[PDB]
Design an enzyme around this catalytic site. Structure first.
Site, PDB file in Angstrom:
ATOM      1  N   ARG A  83       0.321  -1.080   0.127  1.00 43.37           N
ATOM      2  CA  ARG A  83       0.138  -0.088   0.352  1.00 43.37           C
ATOM      3  C   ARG A  83       0.787   1.294   0.323  1.00 43.37           C
ATOM      4  O   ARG A  83       1.915   1.314   1.216  1.00 43.37           O
ATOM      5  CB  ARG A  83      -1.434   0.218   1.222  1.00 43.37           C
ATOM      6  CG  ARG A  83      -1.689   1.425   1.552  1.00 43.37           C
ATOM      7  CD  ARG A  83      -3.026   1.605   1.679  1.00 43.37           C
ATOM      8  NE  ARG A  83      -3.273   2.384   1.415  1.00 43.37           N
ATOM      9  CZ  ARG A  83      -5.281   2.726   2.142  1.00 43.37           C
ATOM     10  NH1 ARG A  83      -5.636   1.596   2.562  1.00 43.37           N
ATOM     11  NH2 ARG A  83      -5.594   3.904   1.980  1.00 43.37           N
ATOM     12  N   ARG A  93      -6.219   1.033  -3.991  1.00 39.78           N
ATOM     13  CA  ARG A  93      -5.067   0.679  -3.627  1.00 39.78           C
ATOM     14  C   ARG A  93      -4.972  -0.870  -3.664  1.00 39.78           C
ATOM     15  O   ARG A  93      -5.761  -2.019  -3.682  1.00 39.78           O
ATOM     16  CB  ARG A  93      -5.340   1.200  -2.097  1.00 39.78           C
ATOM     17  CG  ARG A  93      -6.808   0.423  -1.340  1.00 39.78           C
ATOM     18  CD  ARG A  93      -8.165   0.944  -1.687  1.00 39.78           C
ATOM     19  NE  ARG A  93      -8.303   2.185  -1.877  1.00 39.78           N
ATOM     20  CZ  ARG A  93      -8.647   2.570  -0.915  1.00 39.78           C
ATOM     21  NH1 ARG A  93      -9.557   2.272   0.195  1.00 39.78           N
ATOM     22  NH2 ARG A  93      -8.503   4.227  -0.601  1.00 39.78           N
ATOM     23  N   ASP A  96      -6.835  -2.104   1.951  1.00 39.88           N
ATOM     24  CA  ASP A  96      -7.714  -0.945   2.763  1.00 39.88           C
ATOM     25  C   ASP A  96      -8.121  -2.946   3.674  1.00 39.88           C
ATOM     26  O   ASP A  96      -8.603  -3.025   3.602  1.00 39.88           O
ATOM     27  CB  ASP A  96      -8.764  -0.460   2.276  1.00 39.88           C
ATOM     28  CG  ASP A  96      -8.944   0.752   2.761  1.00 39.88           C
ATOM     29  OD1 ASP A  96      -8.074   1.458   3.391  1.00 39.88           O
ATOM     30  OD2 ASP A  96     -10.342   0.538   2.636  1.00 39.88           O
ATOM     31  N   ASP A  98     -10.123  -1.265   7.303  1.00 37.85           N
ATOM     32  CA  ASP A  98     -10.831   0.028   8.010  1.00 37.85           C
ATOM     33  C   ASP A  98     -11.154  -0.822   9.267  1.00 37.85           C
ATOM     34  O   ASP A  98     -12.485  -2.115   9.347  1.00 37.85           O
ATOM     35  CB  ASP A  98     -11.630   0.679   7.222  1.00 37.85           C
ATOM     36  CG  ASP A  98     -11.517   1.205   6.213  1.00 37.85           C
ATOM     37  OD1 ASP A  98     -10.204   1.738   5.792  1.00 37.85           O
ATOM     38  OD2 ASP A  98     -11.980   1.647   5.177  1.00 37.85           O
TER      39      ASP A  98
HETATM   40  N1  LIG Z   1     -11.630   3.291  11.932  1.00 31.75           N
HETATM   41  C1  LIG Z   1     -10.649   3.562  11.146  1.00 31.75           C
HETATM   42  N2  LIG Z   1     -10.348   2.447  10.717  1.00 31.75           N
HETATM   43  C2  LIG Z   1      -9.028   3.236   9.573  1.00 31.75           C
HETATM   44  N3  LIG Z   1      -8.447   3.620   9.751  1.00 31.75           N
HETATM   45  C3  LIG Z   1      -8.623   5.042  10.329  1.00 31.75           C
HETATM   46  C4  LIG Z   1     -10.599   4.370  11.163  1.00 31.75           C
HETATM   47  N4  LIG Z   1     -10.080   5.921  11.670  1.00 31.75           N
HETATM   48  C5  LIG Z   1      -9.517   6.344  11.546  1.00 31.75           C
HETATM   49  N5  LIG Z   1      -8.403   5.850  10.074  1.00 31.75           N
HETATM   50  C6  LIG Z   1      -7.161   6.859   9.670  1.00 31.75           C
HETATM   51  O1  LIG Z   1      -7.418   7.044   8.251  1.00 31.75           O
HETATM   52  C7  LIG Z   1      -6.259   7.582   8.024  1.00 31.75           C
HETATM   53  C8  LIG Z   1      -6.738   7.715   5.868  1.00 31.75           C
HETATM   54  O2  LIG Z   1      -6.497   6.618   6.087  1.00 31.75           O
HETATM   55  P1  LIG Z   1      -7.448   5.971   4.513  1.00 31.75           P
HETATM   56  O3  LIG Z   1      -7.608   4.356   4.159  1.00 31.75           O
HETATM   57  O4  LIG Z   1      -6.652   7.015   3.623  1.00 31.75           O
HETATM   58  C9  LIG Z   1      -9.341   7.206   4.202  1.00 31.75           C
HETATM   59  P2  LIG Z   1     -10.016   5.752   3.232  1.00 31.75           P
HETATM   60  O5  LIG Z   1     -10.172   4.188   3.718  1.00 31.75           O
HETATM   61  O6  LIG Z   1      -9.615   5.377   1.543  1.00 31.75           O
HETATM   62  O7  LIG Z   1     -11.639   5.907   3.079  1.00 31.75           O
HETATM   63  P3  LIG Z   1     -13.096   5.575   3.785  1.00 31.75           P
HETATM   64  O8  LIG Z   1     -12.057   6.113   5.606  1.00 31.75           O
HETATM   65  O9  LIG Z   1     -13.646   7.091   3.342  1.00 31.75           O
HETATM   66  O10 LIG Z   1     -13.291   4.452   3.634  1.00 31.75           O
HETATM   67  C10 LIG Z   1      -5.337   6.503   8.815  1.00 31.75           C
HETATM   68  O11 LIG Z   1      -3.742   6.920   9.094  1.00 31.75           O
HETATM   69  C11 LIG Z   1      -5.501   6.612  10.025  1.00 31.75           C
HETATM   70  O12 LIG Z   1      -5.380   7.005  10.760  1.00 31.75           O
HETATM   71  N1  LIG Z   2     -16.959  -0.397  -4.222  1.00 26.65           N
HETATM   72  C1  LIG Z   2     -15.931   0.524  -3.145  1.00 26.65           C
HETATM   73  N2  LIG Z   2     -15.583   1.145  -3.527  1.00 26.65           N
HETATM   74  C2  LIG Z   2     -14.719   2.418  -2.325  1.00 26.65           C
HETATM   75  N3  LIG Z   2     -14.678   3.195  -2.318  1.00 26.65           N
HETATM   76  C3  LIG Z   2     -13.272   3.279  -1.827  1.00 26.65           C
HETATM   77  S1  LIG Z   2     -12.595   5.382  -1.264  1.00 26.65           S
HETATM   78  C4  LIG Z   2     -13.721   5.849  -0.149  1.00 26.65           C
HETATM   79  C5  LIG Z   2     -15.409   6.057  -0.231  1.00 26.65           C
HETATM   80  C6  LIG Z   2     -15.633   7.587  -0.335  1.00 26.65           C
HETATM   81  C7  LIG Z   2     -17.173   7.938  -0.809  1.00 26.65           C
HETATM   82  C8  LIG Z   2     -18.242   7.169  -0.704  1.00 26.65           C
HETATM   83  F1  LIG Z   2     -19.757   7.988  -1.386  1.00 26.65           F
HETATM   84  C9  LIG Z   2     -17.970   6.160  -0.592  1.00 26.65           C
HETATM   85  C10 LIG Z   2     -16.492   5.630  -0.406  1.00 26.65           C
HETATM   86  N4  LIG Z   2     -13.530   2.395  -0.933  1.00 26.65           N
HETATM   87  C11 LIG Z   2     -14.019   1.804  -1.771  1.00 26.65           C
HETATM   88  C12 LIG Z   2     -14.199  -0.301  -1.720  1.00 26.65           C
HETATM   89  O1  LIG Z   2     -13.455  -0.288  -0.391  1.00 26.65           O
HETATM   90  N5  LIG Z   2     -15.254  -0.301  -1.349  1.00 26.65           N
HETATM   91 CA   LIG Z   3     -11.375   3.334   2.832  1.00 28.04          CA
HETATM   92 CA   LIG Z   4      -8.484   2.976   5.333  1.00 21.60          CA
HETATM   93 CL   LIG Z   5      -1.657   1.498  -3.091  1.00 21.10          CL
END
Ligand SMILES: Nc1ncnc2c1ncn2[C@@H]1O[C@H](COP(=O)(O)CP(=O)(O)OP(=O)(O)O)[C@@H](O)[C@H]1O
Ligand SMILES: Nc1nc2nc(SCc3ccc(F)cc3)[nH]c2c(=O)[nH]1
Ligand SMILES: [Ca+2]
Ligand SMILES: [Ca+2]
Ligand SMILES: [Cl-]
Ligand SMILES: [Cl-]
Ligand code: NA
Ligand code: NA
EC number: 2.7.6.3
Length: 159
Positions: A83, A93, A96, A98
């Protein structure tokens, strides 16, 4: 001990291989045991759409780690799976991970916000979550079954 629910996503570098590797790596997190793995789902990208479709899943992870300690490990696994951060918001990516939920905990620290701030609006999180935890109740008392009964989410197809 508490049950954490983690969302998995990958849309680069062979998503099926990335997710299977991540599941092996999640089993190596200390003080933690996987309980349940969802089906894998092939989902159209939300946010920027000029990227490949995602493989989305969810995992139930029983842990005695602290929430931020669990976050250290999921970040590690992402980084170890190639990543790379680009400047684009919400770009593709390899992996991911979360943290959707950490028990009934409500956290808004610098690095960590739980429940995931937007999960109740994302069918790609909630459908796999329901598959592994149909009886789930959110910290605020909302039932996962009720969200999915009431709110329009596109139908999810398996990978
Ligand atoms: N519940 C959670 N799970 C994972 N990371 C989290 C989190 N809450 C906050 N973070 C923080 O989120 C920061 C950015 O993560 P990213 O992976 O770039 C966001 P993303 O997953 O692309 O979008 P999304 O959060 O809208 O899905 C991380 O460095 C982490 O510190
Ligand atoms: N299907 C799918 N789409 C994905 N888009 C992302 S970036 C965050 C994002 C941004 C706007 C929104 F409204 C919903 C999610 N992560 C994804 C994933 O895990 N699955
Ligand atoms: Ca995410
Ligand atoms: Ca994330
Ligand atoms: Cl990546
Ligand atoms: Cl990125
Ligand atoms: Na473990
Ligand atoms: Na783009």
């Amino acid at each position: 001990m508490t049950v954490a629910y983690i969302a998995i996503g990958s849309n680069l570098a062979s998503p099926l291989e990335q997710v299977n590797a991540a599941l092996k790596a999640l089993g190596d997190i200390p003080e933690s045991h996987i309980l349940t793995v969802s089906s894998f789902y092939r989902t159209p990208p939300l946010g920027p759409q000029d990227q490949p479709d995602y493989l989305n899943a969810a995992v139930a992870l029983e842990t005695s780690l602290a929430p931020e300690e669990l976050l250290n490990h999921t970040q590690r696994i992402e980084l170890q799976q190639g990543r790379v951060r680009k400047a684009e918001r919400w770009g593709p990516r390899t992996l991911d991970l979360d943290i959707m939920l950490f028990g009934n905990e409500v956290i808004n620290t610098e690095r960590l916000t739980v429940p995931h701030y937007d999960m109740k609006n994302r069918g790609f999180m909630l459908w796999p979550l329901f598959e592994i935890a149909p009886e789930l109740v959110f910290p605020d008392g909302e039932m996962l079954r009720q969200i999915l009964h009431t709110r329009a989410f596109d139908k999810l197809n398996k990978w």
